Design an enzyme around this catalytic site. Structure first.
Site, PDB file in Angstrom:
ATOM      1  N   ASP A  25       0.826  -1.196   0.000  1.00 41.34           N
ATOM      2  CA  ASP A  25       0.000   0.000   0.000  1.00 41.34           C
ATOM      3  C   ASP A  25       0.866   1.254   0.000  1.00 41.34           C
ATOM      4  O   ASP A  25       1.344   1.710   1.039  1.00 41.34           O
ATOM      5  CB  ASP A  25      -0.956   0.001   1.210  1.00 41.34           C
ATOM      6  CG  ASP A  25      -1.974   1.141   1.194  1.00 41.34           C
ATOM      7  OD1 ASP A  25      -2.018   1.927   0.216  1.00 41.34           O
ATOM      8  OD2 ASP A  25      -2.766   1.225   2.193  1.00 41.34           O
ATOM      9  N   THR A  26       1.084   1.817  -1.208  1.00 40.07           N
ATOM     10  CA  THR A  26       1.852   3.067  -1.351  1.00 40.07           C
ATOM     11  C   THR A  26       1.137   4.238  -0.691  1.00 40.07           C
ATOM     12  O   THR A  26       1.751   5.278  -0.480  1.00 40.07           O
ATOM     13  CB  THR A  26       2.163   3.362  -2.813  1.00 40.07           C
ATOM     14  OG1 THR A  26       0.937   3.457  -3.575  1.00 40.07           O
ATOM     15  CG2 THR A  26       3.022   2.281  -3.449  1.00 40.07           C
ATOM     16  N   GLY A  27      -0.153   4.073  -0.393  1.00 36.75           N
ATOM     17  CA  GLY A  27      -0.907   5.118   0.296  1.00 36.75           C
ATOM     18  C   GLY A  27      -0.915   4.965   1.811  1.00 36.75           C
ATOM     19  O   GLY A  27      -1.570   5.728   2.512  1.00 36.75           O
TER      20      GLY A  27
HETATM   21  C1  LIG Z   1      -7.279   7.761   2.878  1.00 36.72           C
HETATM   22  C2  LIG Z   1      -5.975   7.719   3.658  1.00 36.72           C
HETATM   23  C3  LIG Z   1      -4.794   7.474   2.701  1.00 36.72           C
HETATM   24  C4  LIG Z   1      -4.913   6.164   1.873  1.00 36.72           C
HETATM   25  C5  LIG Z   1      -5.092   4.893   2.710  1.00 36.72           C
HETATM   26  C6  LIG Z   1      -5.154   3.674   1.811  1.00 36.72           C
HETATM   27  N1  LIG Z   1      -5.305   2.432   2.561  1.00 36.72           N
HETATM   28  C7  LIG Z   1      -6.040   1.328   1.938  1.00 36.72           C
HETATM   29  C8  LIG Z   1      -6.057   0.108   2.829  1.00 36.72           C
HETATM   30  C9  LIG Z   1      -6.787  -1.161   2.408  1.00 36.72           C
HETATM   31  C10 LIG Z   1      -7.970  -1.442   3.346  1.00 36.72           C
HETATM   32  C11 LIG Z   1      -7.557  -1.596   4.803  1.00 36.72           C
HETATM   33  C12 LIG Z   1      -7.469   1.758   1.716  1.00 36.72           C
HETATM   34  O1  LIG Z   1      -8.116   2.506   2.474  1.00 36.72           O
HETATM   35  N2  LIG Z   1      -8.066   1.224   0.678  1.00 36.72           N
HETATM   36  C13 LIG Z   1      -9.482   1.474   0.351  1.00 36.72           C
HETATM   37  C14 LIG Z   1      -9.657   2.790  -0.379  1.00 36.72           C
HETATM   38  C15 LIG Z   1     -11.085   3.077  -0.826  1.00 36.72           C
HETATM   39  C16 LIG Z   1     -11.528   2.419  -2.108  1.00 36.72           C
HETATM   40  N3  LIG Z   1     -12.806   2.426  -2.354  1.00 36.72           N
HETATM   41  O2  LIG Z   1     -10.717   1.966  -2.888  1.00 36.72           O
HETATM   42  C17 LIG Z   1     -10.060   0.297  -0.428  1.00 36.72           C
HETATM   43  O3  LIG Z   1      -9.425  -0.277  -1.309  1.00 36.72           O
HETATM   44  N4  LIG Z   1     -11.254  -0.104  -0.090  1.00 36.72           N
HETATM   45  C18 LIG Z   1     -11.886  -1.232  -0.708  1.00 36.72           C
HETATM   46  C19 LIG Z   1     -11.735  -2.434   0.219  1.00 36.72           C
HETATM   47  C20 LIG Z   1     -10.295  -2.808   0.752  1.00 36.72           C
HETATM   48  C21 LIG Z   1      -9.623  -4.030   0.047  1.00 36.72           C
HETATM   49  N5  LIG Z   1      -8.202  -4.261   0.409  1.00 36.72           N
HETATM   50  C22 LIG Z   1      -7.634  -5.437   0.551  1.00 36.72           C
HETATM   51  N6  LIG Z   1      -8.324  -6.584   0.418  1.00 36.72           N
HETATM   52  N7  LIG Z   1      -6.351  -5.470   0.886  1.00 36.72           N
HETATM   53  C23 LIG Z   1     -13.324  -0.879  -0.975  1.00 36.72           C
HETATM   54  N8  LIG Z   1     -13.798  -1.145  -2.211  1.00 36.72           N
HETATM   55  O4  LIG Z   1     -13.977  -0.340  -0.099  1.00 36.72           O
HETATM   56  N9  LIG Z   1      -4.031   4.837   3.737  1.00 36.72           N
HETATM   57  C24 LIG Z   1      -4.312   4.486   4.981  1.00 36.72           C
HETATM   58  O5  LIG Z   1      -5.456   4.107   5.303  1.00 36.72           O
HETATM   59  C25 LIG Z   1      -3.240   4.655   6.035  1.00 36.72           C
HETATM   60  N10 LIG Z   1      -3.236   6.047   6.469  1.00 36.72           N
HETATM   61  C26 LIG Z   1      -2.181   6.839   6.337  1.00 36.72           C
HETATM   62  O6  LIG Z   1      -1.156   6.429   5.820  1.00 36.72           O
HETATM   63  C27 LIG Z   1      -2.246   8.282   6.913  1.00 36.72           C
HETATM   64  N11 LIG Z   1      -3.548   8.666   7.418  1.00 36.72           N
HETATM   65  C28 LIG Z   1      -4.275   9.617   6.824  1.00 36.72           C
HETATM   66  C29 LIG Z   1      -5.597   9.932   7.450  1.00 36.72           C
HETATM   67  O7  LIG Z   1      -3.797  10.206   5.837  1.00 36.72           O
HETATM   68  C30 LIG Z   1      -1.178   8.378   7.989  1.00 36.72           C
HETATM   69  C31 LIG Z   1      -1.024   9.811   8.478  1.00 36.72           C
HETATM   70  O8  LIG Z   1      -1.540   7.560   9.084  1.00 36.72           O
HETATM   71  C32 LIG Z   1      -3.446   3.678   7.197  1.00 36.72           C
HETATM   72  C33 LIG Z   1      -3.239   2.214   6.736  1.00 36.72           C
HETATM   73  C34 LIG Z   1      -2.472   3.946   8.355  1.00 36.72           C
HETATM   74  C35 LIG Z   1      -0.970   3.722   8.036  1.00 36.72           C
END
Ligand SMILES: CCCC[C@@H](CN[C@@H](CCCC)C(=O)N[C@@H](CCC(N)=O)C(=O)N[C@@H](CCCNC(N)=[NH2+])C(N)=O)NC(=O)[C@@H](NC(=O)[C@@H](NC(C)=O)[C@@H](C)O)[C@@H](C)CC
Lengths: 99, 99
Positions: A25-27
């Site tokens: 996760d580059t984000g």
């Molecule tokens: C919005 C904040 C920045 C991007 C976000 C991307 N993380 C992924 C993690 C994967 C799930 C736990 C994410 O949210 N992905 C979502 C984004 C929304 C989307 N619709 O694409 C996603 O793919 N969601 C899918 C489901 C997850 C599937 N993933 C998996 N199977 N691995 C969905 N359709 O709802 N980063 C983060 O959540 C990280 N946050 C951060 O790095 C920073 N926080 C903030 C608030 O910027 C830092 C200051 O802490 C977390 C992990 C802490 C280190």
């Protein structure tokens, strides 16, 4: 290797002796691992993303092998829905984005 | 370009005629942008992240220029903490992870 993005970039990691699947996760600034009994001392932390915040335990100097590449750094342990390898460890294995 | 991960992979994008900054996010399935107006009509969806779920507006077939590379695809608009470019558009610009 090269990992395309047609599907979630899930790889095998080794941490605390265990093999697990994790998302590259580059984000993510940090590395967040599901539960996991793990070592002996930690600090409380809260981390956020889409949604809101969760509480986690911060462990330092934890070896994490990522697709066979050794890394060592901070791992946050808590109720994440998916194990996440973030930039703190991606940099140590020489991971880049390319287009 | 080749982008290393010592800092957040923030880039400039163009969407709806407007410039924004967004994070190239291999851990996001979808592209999620802060509240704004987009031409066309939308459908409500919910998406998740570390944390919990938020409500967003789904727009389809939206042109987005990402560091000068063109994509046309789905953009979710809502109360995301950070503008993120997800795999749906990263695949369109040929972005891969390499190590
Ligand atoms: C919005 C904040 C920045 C991007 C976000 C991307 N993380 C992924 C993690 C994967 C799930 C736990 C994410 O949210 N992905 C979502 C984004 C929304 C989307 N619709 O694409 C996603 O793919 N969601 C899918 C489901 C997850 C599937 N993933 C998996 N199977 N691995 C969905 N359709 O709802 N980063 C983060 O959540 C990280 N946050 C951060 O790095 C920073 N926080 C903030 C608030 O910027 C830092 C200051 O802490 C977390 C992990 C802490 C280190």
């Amino acid at each position: 290797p090269q990992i395309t993005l047609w599907k979630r970039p899930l790889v095998t990691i080794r941490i605390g002796g265990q093999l697990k699947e994790a998302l590259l996760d580059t984000g993510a600034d940090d590395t967040v691992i599901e539960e996991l009994n793990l070592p002996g001392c930690w600090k409380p932390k809260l981390i956020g993303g889409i949604x809101g915040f969760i509480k986690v335990r911060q462990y330092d100097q934890i070896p994490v092998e990522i697709a066979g590449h050794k890394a060592i750094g901070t791992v946050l342990v808590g109720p994440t829905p998916v194990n996440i390898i973030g930039r703190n460890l991606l940099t140590q294995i020489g991971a880049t984005l390319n287009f």
